[PDB]
Amino acid sequence: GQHSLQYFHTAVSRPGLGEPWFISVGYVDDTQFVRFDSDAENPRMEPRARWMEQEGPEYWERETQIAKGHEQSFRGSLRTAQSYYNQSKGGSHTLQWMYGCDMGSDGRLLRGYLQFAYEGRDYIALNEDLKTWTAVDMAAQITRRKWEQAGIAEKDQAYLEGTCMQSLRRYLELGKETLLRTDPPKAHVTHHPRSYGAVTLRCWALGFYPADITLTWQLNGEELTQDMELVETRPAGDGTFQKWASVVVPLGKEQNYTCHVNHEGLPEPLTLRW
């Protein structure tokens, strides 16, 4: 039972076509719950989870306020990164920021994090100590010295260990019936023609939550690690996830194989054969 509260920020310039595109998303575990989009007629922090709908105006006003502050900083940051890297005018550049806190099973802080990317590349990152930074290049180092001078690490550490953790537990409280739920996979194995003497056994895991799942195909104990096709875990769109794993197998010998579904929401590992 591990949790996390993460906020994602993305600023994409678009010269001659408006102010930078700023969008922010907030996540509790594998569930998005808040969002801000600079292009909305009225940019504001808005709920994206049903359990965040009983928060009242004050809450959003505040968040909307903070989001805008950051939005402005990102406008200036874009222009700044543009200079540090001396990029010509008229170009599009992205600035990304993601920070959050992981909460261990014991309910205590597991660790915090905060990092930036520019043009999709690691730029600057707060180290696991939450006191020092990792600057990727001379440009980043400039930012590093500035943040060191402003004692920003200290501020982030405080937020990451405190406020971040406080709101997480709190949002977990709000989202109880869904955030703490753990919808187990609906697993079945499907059969598929492939060749004249070989079929594809596809092991499906449906409607589970959280997204973390383990699918493996095996033949008499031995895991068929190399013959296994795995699809990236995907959102069904309704809050749960899907995933499957397949193996190429000779016709007539399907029954011999077995797939093992492992997921928090299961009393114990599943074993499917066909």
């Binding site: 906020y7 922010s24 907030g26 922090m45 505040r62 968040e63 903070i66 989001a67 502050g69 950051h70 900083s73 200036g76 940051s77 700044t80 990164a81 540090y84 600035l95 920021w97 920070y99 930036f116 520019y118 930012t143 500035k146 943040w147 920003i152 501020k155 982030d156 937020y159 990451l160 406020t163 971040c164 709101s167």
Partner: peptide, 9 residues
């Protein structure tokens, strides 16, 4: 809740 600390590059 969003962190209030501004990070200017």
């Amino acid at each position: 809740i969003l962190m209030e600390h501004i990070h200017k590059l």
